[PDB]
């Protein structure tokens, strides 16, 4: 996590404009659609057979919002991601058995989602800041794997 002050202000300024409910649903839905193998964790979510079935699934939307919720909190502790994410890291490992590569796929999808939404506002340099952030979060979420 080598976020220069200016990189941190940039992450923070944009994050101000995000509708986490919405972005959360889009990011998660899109993950399940671009990398269908990730659907392995959600067989109790019902119908994920097509893009519309995934994107509109009330369960995916609610889970996405939860995930992004935890992520937003992460953004207020950019200083201590490991600490912030420790009980979650343990849960994903020990209870959920989620391969951490999943955390990196979601980060990339999220970046595409932010680009989709902010258009020209998501400048090369803003992307570079967010790239560092999703990586830091993925790393924090994997820190307790064993």
């Amino acid at each position: 996590m080598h976020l220069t002050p200016e990189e941190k202000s940039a992450v923070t300024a944009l994050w101000g404009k995000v509708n986490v409910d919405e972005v959360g649903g889009e990011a998660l839905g899109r993950l399940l659609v671009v990398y269908p193998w990730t659907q392995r964790f959600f067989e109790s979510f019902g119908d994920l057979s097509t893009p519309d079935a995934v994107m509109g699934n009330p369960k995916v939307k609610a889970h996405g919002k939860k995930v992004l919720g935890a992520f937003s909190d992460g953004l207020a502790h950019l200083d201590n991601l490991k600490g912030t994410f420790a009980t979650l890291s343990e849960l994903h490992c020990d209870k959920l058995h989620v391969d951490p590569e999943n955390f990196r796929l979601l980060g990339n999808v999220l970046v595409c989602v932010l680009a989709h939404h902010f258009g020209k506002e998501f400048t090369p340099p803003v992307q570079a800041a967010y790239q560092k952030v999703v990586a830091g979060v993925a790393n924090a979420l994997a820190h307790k794997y064993h």
Partner: protein, 141 residues
Amino acid sequence: VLSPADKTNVKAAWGKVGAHAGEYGAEALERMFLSFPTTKTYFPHFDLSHGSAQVKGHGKKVADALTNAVAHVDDMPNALSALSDLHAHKLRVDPVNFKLLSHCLLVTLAAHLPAEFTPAVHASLDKFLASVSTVLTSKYR
């Protein structure tokens, strides 16, 4: 493998790129240089400053090649043979870097085609770039 659906998706999204391909190619490069600085090791000879003509020049070349793969979506291995040879034999770019550029290309398109960058299209474009990358790396060893 790309399905009929994928093919339609790609031709459609790329269709919209039209005349901006060049500029979107340049932008994907800059995004890549900024987010994954290790990719810069391959362009020691380039002026990577903002608005660099070398980068502009290069973005166009990459875009033309992608445009050519879309035009020959049913015969990419053959349409890209030459480029596959260049990369394997001269440039010798480590394979991991293809995924990085692909990623920056997807970000660029997303940033410019909001109405078209649907989940379905996103998935199609991702499979496409993966296939291009596979072709370009096929003769490495």
